[PDB]
Amino acid sequence: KKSKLEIIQAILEACKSGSPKTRIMYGANLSYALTGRYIKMLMDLEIIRQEGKQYMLTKKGEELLEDIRKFNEMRKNMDQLKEKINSVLS
Amino acid sequence: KKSKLEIIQAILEACKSGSPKTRIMYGANLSYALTGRYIKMLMDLEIIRQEGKQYMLTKKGEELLEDIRKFNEMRKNMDQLKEKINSVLS
């Protein structure tokens, strides 16, 4: 099960190069109805924008996606360092 | 209440420049008996060593303390980035 942040990241990743609603739906593993609710939320915050049937990232959305990717990389490195620490103590 | 890792860090920080048992006890906020148990554990793992009445870090212990400090800094930066992300989404 994806967390709220993982759902948002999936939506932004799809919108990075432009994406229709159905692609966003399957990418975030959401019902069609829930996909609409997330899209509306992100559009209201001006994180994504719409061009015809496609959804794309705004500059704000691009920066947000970058921050999320950076956050996930930090988590990965932290988890690995924790394994290093634990190996020394056990 | 300190976590196990916070207790260990407090002990290593005290041992960095050499420390008697009582100083370690108050630094880690442990009973005298528990302080002895942690000291024995770290000595068995060769993380700390004893010179007279003083306890000091071994090279292994120095590296461990550095890893813990790095880990805590990573956590701080991660928490701050999470605040940045949350501010954009709310």
UniProtKB/TrEMBL annotation, chains A, B:
**Alphabetized Pfam families for the sequence:** HTH_45
Q: Specify the superkingdom.
A: Archaea
UniProt keyword annotation of DNA-binding present: yes
> Which UniProt key words apply to this protein?
Coiled coil, DNA-binding
- In this chain the ArnR1-like winged helix-turn-helix domain maps to 1-76
Q: Extract the GO molecular function terms from the UniProt entry.
A: DNA binding
Which parts form a coiled-coil structure per UniProt? 64-90
- The protein here is known as DNA-binding protein
Naturally occurring in which organism (per UniProt): Saccharolobus solfataricus
Q: Which gene encodes it?
A: sso10a
